[PDB]
Design a protein around this ligand. Structure first.
Ligand SMILES: [Ca+2]
Length: 192
């Protein structure tokens, strides 16, 4: 029941659901997954089903990991609902702390150049083959996009990017926001 309250607590104005609606979704969730827990592979299946034009396995794995920096174990209903909101609802700039957790692949508290490339590659694979030709030349491969992000942050190859700086840059430089953007529809849309 009151798992819905803590979901609302953590999404706040990001929510697309009332407490009653979340409880309804939860009861349906329990019919299909009675433990109230979903594994990474079950989570990946949701994205595979709903992004048929793409190759969403890596993306879904990184989103799952954003909760804990762990590929093992499960998400509960709260984390599952929050995950779907992060990928698919609301405004990117209301998600910046979560975005830091997405990009900090190993969970060590800072983002490295390789981590940016890993996440940018996973997001890139969410784009349909048809759409990637609308990409600007200097943003049309994962390497180009990740290096542009790293350059906008003023970083050398072995530098570390902190949460403070990530939040600042993603707020202030709209090119950084556009390039780190992780919601597939928003990448698609801005492209078009
Ligand atoms: Ca890291």
């Amino acid at each position: 029941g009151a798992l819905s309250k803590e979901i609302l607590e953590e999404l706040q104005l990001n929510t697309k659901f009332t407490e009653e609606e979340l409880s309804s979704w939860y009861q349906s969730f329990l019919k299909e997954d009675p433990s109230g827990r979903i594994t990474r592979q079950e989570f990946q299946t949701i994205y595979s089903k709903f992004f048929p034009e793409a190759d969403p396995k890596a993306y879904a794995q990184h989103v799952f990991r954003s909760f804990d920096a762990n590929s093992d174990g499960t998400l509960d209903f709260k984390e599952y609902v929050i995950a779907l909101h992060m990928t698919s609802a609301g405004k990117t700039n209301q998600k910046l702390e979560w975005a830091f957790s997405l990009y900090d692949v190993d969970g060590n508290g800072t983002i490295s150049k390789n981590e940016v490339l890993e996440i940018v590659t996973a997001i890139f694979k969410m784009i349909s083959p048809e759409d990637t030709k609308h990409l600007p030349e200097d943003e049309n491969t994962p390497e180009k996009r990740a290096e542009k992000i790293w350059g906008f942050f003023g970083k050398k190859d072995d530098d570390k990017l902190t949460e403070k700086e990530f939040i600042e840059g993603t707020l202030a430089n709209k090119e950084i926001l556009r390039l780190i953007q992780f919601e597939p529809q928003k990448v698609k849309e801005k492209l078009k």
